[PDB]
Amino acid sequence: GSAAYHIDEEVGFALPNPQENLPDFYNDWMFIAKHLPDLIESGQLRERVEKLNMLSIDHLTDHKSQRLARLVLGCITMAYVWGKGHGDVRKVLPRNIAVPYCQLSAALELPPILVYADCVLANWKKKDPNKPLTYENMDVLFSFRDGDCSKGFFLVSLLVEIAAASAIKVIPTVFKAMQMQERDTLLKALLEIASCLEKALQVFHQIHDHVNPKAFFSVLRIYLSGWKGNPQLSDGLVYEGFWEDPKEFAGGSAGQSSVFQCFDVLLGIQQTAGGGHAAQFLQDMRRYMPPAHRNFLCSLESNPSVREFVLSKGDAGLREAYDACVKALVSLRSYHLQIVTKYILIPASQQPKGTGGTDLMNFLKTVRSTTEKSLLKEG
Ligand code: HEM
């Protein structure tokens, strides 16, 4: 929960109180991003992007301004590449978006595609500043199409992140209690983490109230899709004026959250490097996370193993508190598998991920079972 790693005590990995407006200099960008439903529907989005002048990034003078600009340019990019979302794609992102988008992304150490830390961690607003972080008091900054359920998908992801924050802020307490040899403190800390994680599973149920499977699978998913192993942009995307040859970048999204990995590493659940395929996907998604949060995960992996400390103590109270965290992480990913069945697998069966969810489910079920196989029980 330390603020050397851009981790907020209240909202966790989410960007605390994100910026809503840019300097007047960028009005031309702001207008397009704010009006994607109209501009896409009316078929004028591509023209508006192609007729932008090149705006410098030097007038973006702080981190929150850069994050808003990244979110703005990534939303335009995604809208430009996929158009109305029915196969009329563009394989060259015009110079006057691509160069500033790519400079800004190098400064922020993120890939120049829309990622979770844009469309979720930075894409939100309090309606009334003085009321709490509840769904009915929040809004997103940007959507793609009327009916795309972006508000429901993004905010319910956000609210799960905010829930996780109360378990994340406990993490220093764990390592300190280990280092100071405080058995009761360590046990309290572990139960508190599990309780908060169980809370976050409850918050996850809201997704059904605010996202409709046909909308997500058939609309929002299109705009979160990228160009890594995508037959529609077989060779990646040309960032005109910045790199000569195209580059592939994964249209991740939901799966770029650091929350599950945060607790995987805490609980020494060797999963990041413990195998072949699934461990490779999990490592690749780290490049799509903010750098400060990439560093957090590493500095957690370098610490004394909590799972070893608990194993070494001959202490059933400790082992049971540790297992409550592992169970809440299993529960969360189990529920997540159901969510993916409702919102990806079933709609693909009707008409299409593309009936290629067998590999999807297998990747999710592997990670779940490896989490479950970390339960300690009597040993
Ligand atoms: C609401 C909060 C959500 C969180 C916190 C979350 C988090 C994650 C995480 C951590 C992974 C990596 C796998 C793992 O560690 O077990 C993942 C993968 C994935 N998630 Fe989610 N997810 C959420 C919602 C959703 C929803 C609603 C969908 C789809 C409708 C979804 C679709 C996927 C898919 C398809 C993958 C596989 C990786 C990929 O193809 O990019 N997630 N998610």
UniProtKB/Swiss-Prot annotation:
Its EC number is 1.13.11.52. InterPro entries: Indolamine_dOase (IPR000898), Trp/Indoleamine_2_3_dOase-like (IPR037217). Keywords: Cytoplasm, Dioxygenase, Heme, Immunity, Iron, Metal-binding, Oxidoreductase, Tryptophan catabolism. It catalyses: D-tryptophan + O2 = N-formyl-D-kynurenine; L-tryptophan + O2 = N-formyl-L-kynurenine. Pathway: Amino-acid degradation; L-tryptophan degradation via kynurenine pathway; L-kynurenine from L-tryptophan: step 1/2. Belongs to the indoleamine 2,3-dioxygenase family. IDO1 is the target for therapy in a range of clinical settings, including cancer, chronic infections, autoimmune and allergic syndromes, and transplantation. IDO1 and IDO2 are 2 distinct enzymes which catalyze the same reaction. IDO2 affinity for tryptophan is much lower than that of IDO1. 50% of Caucasians harbor polymorphisms which abolish IDO2 enzymatic activity. IDO2 is expressed in human tumors in an inactive form: tryptophan degradation is entirely provided by IDO1 in these cells. IDO2 may play a role as a negative regulator of IDO1 by competing for heme-binding with IDO1. Low efficiency IDO2 enzymes have been conserved throughout vertebrate evolution, whereas higher efficiency IDO1 enzymes are dispensable in many lower vertebrate lineages. This is Indoleamine 2,3-dioxygenase 1.
